[PDB]
Design a protein around this ligand. Structure first.
Ligand SMILES: CN1C[C@@H](O)C[C@H]1C(=O)O
Length: 780
């Protein structure tokens, strides 16, 4: 009860503004270490950053740090995406989606030493000039969205946090000296491996530096402190910050500062989405246990710490251009923390600490510990399960729920063995990865299945921009049979993904040379290889993944043609084309028999079957292709692109008006699930989950009049078990009066800190663009 430090309303009354500080340090680091090998002049100016960076502790903190200079700041990395800002230099402040304030004077810095150095030298700039011909058109004609991962650094991986807590930069330096001593600059390949290893030495040094300046500030705050209490907490914030990364953790306090200290450095250098701290309930437990039975911490002192950490997680803002924001509104960092599941010996893995990590989200209720669960029905206690469901019906959006039994073989289906794959941890939205051991763009680019449907009915040409976007599959009125049809729908899938594999292959080669680290500092192999995450170095290198969006709309559109055209012969294609071309202006009798046909989600065998055929094909299709890091992977997750992808697709044989959102993930189109919620699951069980080893996403919008009877809890639980027992991968819930959302678009102000599940993550309703707000509204 007495943890009344919600005095971190500081974070809600804060405004997003660019933070071009670090961008200036980096500029200076580069200029003085020119001629160095790029990993050395990157890592030498990282030390510069944390040596000459703001250092600030805010008025009530027990855990400290911040990747920038401001709270809710937008971090520019000019080495990767400088020109994003030079473009929107005088709009970004007032843009509709995800805006940032660019102060009067930060903008002097930008075109005075940031812009005149970096002009023509960035990752993103190389991507704009090299994206392949066919890929580039499809991107333009609205068919897929590749530019996101050329502005946002690596991300989408859970780093080697457990080592930094357990060895500290002290013990990692030994690993560095071990493999440096085994090399010989006389010997063929060794200079590159020795030179990189130096960069790993600067960055270890830079973290050290930073963490001690932090304690230093905490002594300064002490020796001016009136409050007996808040003085004696400052002194322990220094006693910690002095040990923390340099040496191994020894207390609960000292683990959480190890962790988050490292967390912000990795986000310092690149700013990517989805740096997931991972199985936090598993490697912190030994510290929690021994501190309980010693007095150094009491359970309530624990959950205070956590609730602070959770407010620090809610602190930064993911930086993106004008448009990628539309495709992922809400500043989301996607920092996945997960509890529960299975042990290295196959036994339940859930301790007191799994519940208190669920607990701190019921308490703080900010958006940025992306909570998650690995529920192992045959291992995790019903007691665990209850606490999960109680969380959910806070309408919080949290936590996303994964069926542990599915997530394991997804990781086996990736080539990892059960000896290490039990540790899989949700990553970002719903992706999979593995702590310290997997490089992998778990979601390189999205592809618009709505556009495709619109392509086969239009024989390649784009309705809206009137160009020959895709290949010419022939016009739809010479398909004698249904298979002639399906044939052309596959051919159209095949043309798009090719282009994506080109683009992936191109940006792999850009990330290679030019986008190095010291995140890699926490991958054991990267150290003994003398080889970076970007280059190889990771234990298991996995091909990039390609997320599809428009599931509901493929199935419904294709089956609508099998029904009405090829064996119920009610409409000739001739006329269908006419109907959708015109948005059903005159033709609004057709739009009717379409939304009469079985829909994906009500669970009609004829549909579930086609749903299986298509996507086993889409899987075989991708695993065909290989880059330098293994064969490609796929998933189904939209983030928020289902809405703006919707705006480029015409009307479709599914009964969908033109320019509406596309479906979201593997959920149905809004207004087609007139059967149950238990038949929502069953229609989606036929999606082959373990073939899409990078994740699957389900959205469901519960009405809040449910938390009433004293079984809503007992009954939500049992439904979670249906999901798992059917072999479905993931489900997550909203629990909200429409009444509230509707008012909040009216008066955005008296609804601060109100949450919603968008897809994979959680945003503040008021801070999203109106389009996506409707999309979320219209869900049943
Ligand atoms: C679609 N991506 C998957 C999530 O990890 C990251 C998201 C994004 O960066 O926008």
């Amino acid at each position: 009860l007495d943890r009344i430090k919600r005095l971190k309303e500081r974070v809600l009354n804060t405004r997003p503004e660019m933070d071009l500080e670090n961008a200036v340090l980096l500029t200076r680091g580069f200029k003085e270490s020119e001629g160095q090998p790029l990993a050395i002049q990157k890592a030498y100016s990282f030390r510069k950053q944390c040596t000459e960076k703001t250092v600030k502790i805010w008025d009530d903190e027990l855990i400290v740090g911040n990747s920038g200079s401001k709270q809710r700041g937008g971090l520019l990395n000019p080495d990767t995406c400088w020109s994003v800002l030079e473009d929107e230099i005088d709009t970004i402040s007032e843009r509709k989606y995800d805006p940032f304030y660019l102060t009067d004077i930060d903008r002097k810095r930008f075109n005075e030493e940031i812009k005149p150095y970096w002009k023509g030298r960035s990752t993103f700039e190389k991507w704009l000039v090299q994206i392949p011909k066919e890929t580039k058109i499809l991107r333009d004609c609205g068919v897929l969205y590749i530019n996101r991962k050329a502005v946002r650094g690596w991300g989408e991986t859970t780093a080697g946090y457990e080592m930094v807590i357990n060895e500290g930069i002290e013990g990692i330096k030994r690993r560095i000296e071990e493999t440096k001593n085994n090399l010989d600059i006389t010997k063929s390949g060794h200079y590159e491996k020795l030179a990189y290893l130096k960069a790993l030495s600067l960055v270890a040094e830079g973290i050290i530096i930073l963490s001690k300046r932090y304690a230093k500030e905490a002594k300064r705050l002490a020796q001016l402190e009136t409050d007996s209490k808040r003085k004696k907490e400052l002194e322990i914030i220094a006693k910690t910050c002095d040990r923390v990364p340099e040496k191994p953790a020894r207390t609960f306090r000292e683990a959480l500062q190890s962790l988050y200290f490292y967390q912000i450095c990795i986000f310092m250098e690149q700013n990517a989405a989805s740096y997931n701290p991972g199985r936090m309930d598993q490697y912190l437990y030994p510290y929690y246990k021994s501190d309980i039975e010693s007095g150094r911490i009491t359970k309530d002192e624990a959950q205070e710490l956590l609730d602070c950490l959770w407010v620090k997680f809610s602190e930064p803002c993911l930086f993106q251009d004008e448009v990628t924001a539309q495709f992922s509104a809400g500043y989301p960092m996607f920092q996945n923390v997960c509890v529960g599941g299975i042990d290295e010996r196959g036994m339940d893995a859930v301790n007191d600490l799994s519940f208190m990590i669920l607990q701190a989200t019921m308490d703080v209720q900010l958006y940025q510990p992306s909570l998650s669960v690995r529920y192992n029905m045959s291992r995790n206690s019903n007691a665990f399960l209850k606490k999960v469901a109680e969380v959910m019906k806070l309408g919080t959006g949290f936590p996303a729920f994964h069926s542990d039994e599915v997530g394991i073989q997804m990781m086996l289906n990736k080539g990892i063995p059960m000896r290490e794959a039990y540790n899989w941890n949700p990553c970002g939205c719903v992706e999979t990865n593995l702590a310290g051991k997997q490089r992998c763009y778990t979601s390189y680019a999205d592809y618009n299945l709505g556009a495709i449907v619109e392509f086969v009915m239009n024989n390649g040409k784009s309705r809206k921009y009137n160009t020959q976007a895709s290949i010419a599959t022939g016009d739809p009125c010479t398909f004698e049979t249904y298979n002639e049809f399906l044939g052309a729908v596959k051919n159209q899938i095949r043309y798009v993904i090719r282009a994506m594999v080109a683009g992936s292959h191109v940006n792999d080669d850009i990330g290679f040379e030019r986008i190095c680290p010291a995140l890699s500092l926490s991958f054991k192999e990267c150290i003994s290889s003398a080889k970076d995450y970007a280059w190889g170095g990771a234990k298991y290198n996995i091909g990039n993944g390609l997320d599809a969006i428009g599931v509901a709309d493929l199935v419904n559109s294709v089956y609508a043609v099998k029904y009405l055209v090829y064996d119920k012969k009610l409409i000739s294609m001739e006329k269908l084309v006419k109907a959708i071309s015109n948005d059903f202006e005159g033709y609004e009798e057709i739009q009717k028999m379409c939304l009469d046909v079985p829909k994906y989600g009500n669970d009609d065998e004829e549909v579930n079957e086609l749903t299986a055929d298509l996507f086993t094909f889409i899987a075989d299709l991708i695993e065909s292709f290989s880059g330098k890091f293994g064969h490609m992977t796929a998933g189904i997750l939209p983030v928020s692109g289902n809405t703006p992808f919707g705006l480029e697709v015409g009307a479709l044989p599914s009964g969908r008006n033109a320019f509406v959102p596309l479906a979201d993930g593997v959920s149905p189109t809004a207004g087609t699930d007139i059967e149950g919620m238990g038949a929502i699951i069953k229609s989606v069980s036929h999606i082959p989950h373990i073939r899409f080893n990078q994740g699957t996403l389900l959205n469901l919008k519960l009405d809040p009049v449910f938390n009433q009877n004293a079984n809503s809890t007992e009954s939500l639980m049992a439904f979670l078990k249906s999901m798992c027992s059917l072999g479905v991968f993931h489900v997550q819930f909203n629990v909200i009066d429409k009444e509230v959302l509707l008012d909040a678009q009216k008066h955005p102000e008296n609804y601060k800190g109100l949450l919603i599940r968008v897809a994979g993550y959680t945003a503040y309703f008021v801070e999203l663009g109106k389009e996506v707000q409707d999309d979320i509204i219209a869900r049943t």
